[PDB]
Write a protein that binds this ligand. Sequence first.
Ligand SMILES: Nc1ncnc2c1ncn2[C@@H]1O[C@@H](COP(=O)(O)OP(=O)(O)OP(O)(O)=S)[C@H](O)[C@H]1O
Ligand SMILES: Nc1ncnc2c1ncn2[C@H]1O[C@H](COP(=O)(O)OP(=O)(O)O)[C@@H](O)[C@H]1O
Ligand SMILES: Nc1ncnc2c1ncn2[C@H]1O[C@H](COP(=O)(O)OP(=O)(O)O)[C@H](O)[C@H]1O
Ligand SMILES: Nc1ncnc2c1ncn2[C@H]1O[C@H](COP(=O)(O)OP(=O)(O)O)[C@H](O)[C@H]1O
Lengths: 578, 116, 116, 562, 116
Amino acid sequence: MENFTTNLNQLARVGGIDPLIGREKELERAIQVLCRRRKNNPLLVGESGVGKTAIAEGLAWRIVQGDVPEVMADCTIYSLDIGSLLAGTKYRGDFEKRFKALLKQLEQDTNSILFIDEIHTIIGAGAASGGQVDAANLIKPLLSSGKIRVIGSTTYQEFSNIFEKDRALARRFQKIDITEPSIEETVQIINGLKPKYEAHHDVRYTAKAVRAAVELAVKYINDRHLPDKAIDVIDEAGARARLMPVSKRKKTVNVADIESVVARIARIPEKSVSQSDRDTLKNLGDRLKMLVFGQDKAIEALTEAIKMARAGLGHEHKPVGSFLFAGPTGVGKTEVTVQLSKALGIELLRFDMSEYMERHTVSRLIGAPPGYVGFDQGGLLTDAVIKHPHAVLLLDEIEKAHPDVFNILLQVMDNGTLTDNNGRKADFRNVVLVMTTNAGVRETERKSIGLIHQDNSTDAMEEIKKIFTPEFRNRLDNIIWFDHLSTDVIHQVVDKFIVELQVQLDQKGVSLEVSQEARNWLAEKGYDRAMGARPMARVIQDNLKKPLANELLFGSLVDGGQVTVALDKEKNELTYGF
Amino acid sequence: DEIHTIIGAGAASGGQVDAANLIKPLLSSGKIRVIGSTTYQEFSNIFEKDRALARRFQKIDITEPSIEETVQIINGLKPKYEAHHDVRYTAKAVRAAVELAVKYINDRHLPDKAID
Amino acid sequence: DEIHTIIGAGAASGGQVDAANLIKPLLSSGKIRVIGSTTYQEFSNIFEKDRALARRFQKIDITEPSIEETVQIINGLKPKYEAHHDVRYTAKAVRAAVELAVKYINDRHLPDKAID
Amino acid sequence: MENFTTNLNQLARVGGIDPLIGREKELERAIQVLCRRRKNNPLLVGESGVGKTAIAEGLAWRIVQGDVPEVMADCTIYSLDIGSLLAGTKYRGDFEKRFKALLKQLEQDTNSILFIDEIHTIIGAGAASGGQVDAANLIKPLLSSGKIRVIGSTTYQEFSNIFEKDRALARRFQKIDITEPSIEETVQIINGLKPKYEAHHDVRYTAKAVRAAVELAVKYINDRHLPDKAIDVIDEAGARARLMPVSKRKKTVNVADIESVVARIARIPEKSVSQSDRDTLKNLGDRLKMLVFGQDKAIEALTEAIKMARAGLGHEHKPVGSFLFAGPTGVGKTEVTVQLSKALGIELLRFDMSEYMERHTVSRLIGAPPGYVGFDQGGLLTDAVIKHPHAVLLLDEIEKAHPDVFNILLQVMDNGTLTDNNGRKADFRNVVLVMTTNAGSTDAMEEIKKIFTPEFRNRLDNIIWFDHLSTDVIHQVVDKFIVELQVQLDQKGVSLEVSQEARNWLAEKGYDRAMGARPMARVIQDNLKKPLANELLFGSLVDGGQVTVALDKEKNELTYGF
Amino acid sequence: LLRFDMSEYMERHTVSRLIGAPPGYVGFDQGGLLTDAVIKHPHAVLLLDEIEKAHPDVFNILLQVMDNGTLTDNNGRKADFRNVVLVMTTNAGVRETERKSIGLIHQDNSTDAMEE
Ligand SMILES: Nc1ncnc2c1ncn2[C@@H]1O[C@@H](COP(=O)(O)OP(=O)(O)OP(O)(O)=S)[C@H](O)[C@H]1O
Ligand SMILES: Nc1ncnc2c1ncn2[C@H]1O[C@H](COP(=O)(O)OP(=O)(O)O)[C@@H](O)[C@H]1O
Ligand SMILES: Nc1ncnc2c1ncn2[C@H]1O[C@H](COP(=O)(O)OP(=O)(O)O)[C@H](O)[C@H]1O
Ligand SMILES: Nc1ncnc2c1ncn2[C@H]1O[C@H](COP(=O)(O)OP(=O)(O)O)[C@H](O)[C@H]1O
């Protein structure tokens, strides 16, 4: 019945079917199966984008071409359109008659093989309500009787969902594994298809553009298989070249056009390297050194890792870098990470490890299981990374996390990817991972017994070593011990905090001038190298903010104006007029 | 819009096949062109499950605008609001709306937090 | 065969839809004897946990034959393949099919796969 | 109801239901409950296989016979098919519309009684999927105000999972305790059912066969309760006997056929359950002496103790015996124990007591208290003795265990049992306890005695002493090792003969007064098996080959070739 | 090559999943990780990384395999290890050969890692 089946040999005879490239063994295996005594129903199983249909059509083509032995040559090969059978829509029982009429006629033709694409839609006869709900059962008798030979086609999940469970299929069909082609096979396939794309887009491709589409898609696109992933790049490059100009220019597509296309598909960056921003890249060290004073070594470690990735001297299975920051409190560990994401113009993903102190909570990172209270919540980490693949990832207080988080971190550090409980994957290769810790802190507050105090920083390192075991430590790029703030740093910190105050006052119409002597006094009064910068913020709050707050509310400052601060001879602050 | 809602439109028999199935052959053949639209969650829980349609579309990520982009969008739109309400906004009022909305409202992104 | 598909309710629209209960009077009255057939996972999911079965059926553990038996099974069936494909097999070839099968077959066991 | 229930009076009037034997008390109580003006709903609570459902059928039979108070006249007990009632719903309005119809048909009959089999899944929960519902709330105001009186049936565990916790059901039913019957009661049940089994299989059972079926099942089959498992033994023996006539065998089913059946069910070597043991015992000491050379006194002392246990002169509340095996390393304490378990046809359980030196490991053997980490993993000792109740239990180096494990041992030796952290009993009455030690008699005593104070030593049946090896024995041990290799080589087509100077050397080298025969395994393997394995695999020595092993006087190497 | 990392099996909580013990894990119908691997790839080399970290119950199972070649799963399957090579990797005692002495020479030794 011509209403439901397409004669593929007829298509090959009047063209319609292209020659198959690189799957000659696959066709011979299918023929070998068709000529068997039992299970002579080959089933082609493979990944999306690898040519499963192309192979089935390729057989009809070879029959017509004359490359098939007399055992199967001149056999009619037909392709079944389920949508046609189920298009009748109306009248219960007519669906079953249409299905049967087709099968009876195919049985009668005898020297006929039926090809069913998407065979898994027959088994269970899906169509919301269904078929021909028993379409599988209606065909099974001819498969069991050895009367019809069916070439199937499906994928791996569906093979498992149905073919591995329904023994009436398991004992009738013979699975053939159809794999993705090689780089060279893909190029040959593209070149075979090529004129179709060139004709559609009125473009031409260079040999290099073809090779590049294959190599770049393989390097960066991980949700597809060859040849389609490369074909897709070729088609998009074609459209890009076609639509880009006003005048018929740049008709020939080159590698650079391919690079732009792959870069835009993966939401990655490209390859200038310093695209048009290598000149902002070179200044990270300074933009950060103006915000974090001291700790130059931490700034540099981060800065160099970023440049290496941009320079191409990286590793395509690793995070951009993996750092553990440690040191005395109040020294800028989290300060540096936050400013880095700003300096780079990217999103910061923050997780606070103290909230994940139970094994139950790793479900809040991977994603709640199908289905217990729901499951329609992916992992917090998985979704954050997919939405923002270039983010800086900051995990605070890592030593406070439940130990199972480390199994998760080691996986990410080892291969660059984490799989969600729903099967989706997060790509961490463009993500910078920084973890911070206070693991050795209790040691730096300890005092020695004696006349001369000792340096306890080596004890702090021993504590780190006993928490983060060698298998973890051996996967990091750097464990960086941040220093205590020197007096010179304190002076820079005081100015930083004064500026933040000046900015807040400006919104009230109040300007503020502080003398150098007043600053020197606050700097002397406000710090302890053992405490870090946090106490400096506190001295400013008591010496400058309190007096101002009273005036802003009841002080002459209620309407805006100017204040100054001077230090007097008693080292007291001398207040403002207005 | 809300393309994940086209799945299951027809329903409950008498073999009544629904939509987003009745359309597979037209997207597959290149006969028609469509534009889809989903949120990340809707497209992470419903839309993607029917792999056949997921394969016929190109996913384009629409990200949140920057602060300056938001200000510019508002300047472009403000004549609609001025006309509607018989008001005039100052230049400072627009920039303040964007900065304050970002600092204090954490429920939505830009430029909605500012337009509202 | 595949008795667990008869035991579960909802075997098919129409089915056998109520097969699960329709078989019970026969198992209970003894008018018709049943020999069933299933696998190990289905057995523990269906029979071990249901009084309807735990009070009606016995289990016989069916395991694979020996390597020598696999060869004899083929030799018993062998003439059919020789006739079907107009071929003859070397006794060593029969043994090789089995001896090599044990180095790569576990996707299904022997003899069915050595026969293939 | 026609397609949901079965009329048990209709079956009783025809056949179907066997009269019950000996459960008059359970039936009298069920009647008192049914006769109440309210909450006249008995709930039968038991174990599987104890007459739990048989009672409901038994009552329907009495009713058609008329052996009931007039109160019960004209009553009909309908059995509910839960699967029929629950299957085929899906939509939200279907369960009720079906259950509502079932009840009105039953309700119209004031003498109707509904029987729910295993009431612990059709009362919630249960699984609320599509069409609602796996519910009892729907009955709950019926058999509680009320007009319908349903006989329930469940098990002790399910009872406490639902009832008690849900008062909604707990107070609508009267609980009736159904306990497993005794040996005598089981025999009487069989005798009354027997005529139908004899007719079915064209067999006759002896009186002894019936008693044996009951007692052997109790001793060897630990999967099921008595009044049911004893029936399988009778019916299975009958079934084989029904097929036996193909070889012209006889109608009578004797004890031997019962024994074959029990051993088959329990997965025990044939007839090791009964009389193969008499010949084994006659030859037990002799067989052990063929594998262990020397230690003749030890083997004989052990053999005699075993025989009196087998003779039945021991105690029920004890292990079948408790022995301490004392002596030097490598003298066969372990080897005798291993061969003994094989000789007797039973499995061996082994524990290394050196792994239980620390205080927290004591709970490792029994199981942690509930709420403590790992309690749900169970113990190591008590599950082993539940799974394998007839095993040989060997405890190595019991002269190193933490003192608390000795309290575990004293309890076992004293009364035969331990309680698991899940409340289950580990029954040691059919196992034999062998403990080994390097303690040594006064000194051996003080070193073990230190924990095995008189309070412990009085619980041992004996002390078996294991002697040092003589020079003749070390030569015999080597001959055994060489022979095992000779057998493997014959199977591979190679003949091997080791010279006398080669045997003397290996015996002298592989024996150490401080390790006994233990080092022998490597001396033989490294000097003889290894060099030979290399040649055989290389193919210089092939099937049909012969090697003779001589010593090189200046090296003492084992030298041979072909 | 089959691989397992013993650092993931430092407690009974996860050991049962590796073993395939009938009780003790989710996904029991699929058996153990170990027993399935030995069925799919019966001739494989089995590598256990960082064995000194393994919980004692892992060791009880390894001893069972060493004694008779078989572990039994409760889904009607057995892990037959007679065709595999078992390799354990350790770092025991390595640290002790890098220990410093308490002498003016010092050097003293090269210790034996076998002690650990
Ligand atoms: N080198 C620095 N330059 C300027 N400000 C700094 C510097 N170091 C610390 N600060 C200030 O003190 C920091 C207080 O917050 P954090 O930086 O997160 O503290 P931390 O150093 O990360 O240590 P923790 O996380 O509180 S234990 C602020 O980042 C800064 O205002
Ligand atoms: N007559 C024997 N005496 C001692 N050991 C023997 C004898 N025959 C065999 N063996 C076995 O001796 C060693 C094991 O000894 P074992 O039973 O463990 O002694 P024990 O338990 O007293 O320490 C192995 O060489 C094995 O062959
Ligand atoms: N080796 C080949 N020779 C000829 N055409 C091929 C080959 N491989 C793939 N194809 C063709 O099939 C691919 C599409 O896959 P298809 O056969 O429809 O199965 P699926 O739907 O799973 O992706 C390519 O887009 C198309 O050009
Ligand atoms: N006292 C008895 N008199 C007659 N038959 C009995 C008696 N006790 C038990 N039976 C017989 O009926 C029983 C029916 O099963 P039963 O023990 O009541 O509950 P369940 O089906 O849950 O295991 C036994 O399987 C069977 O041997």
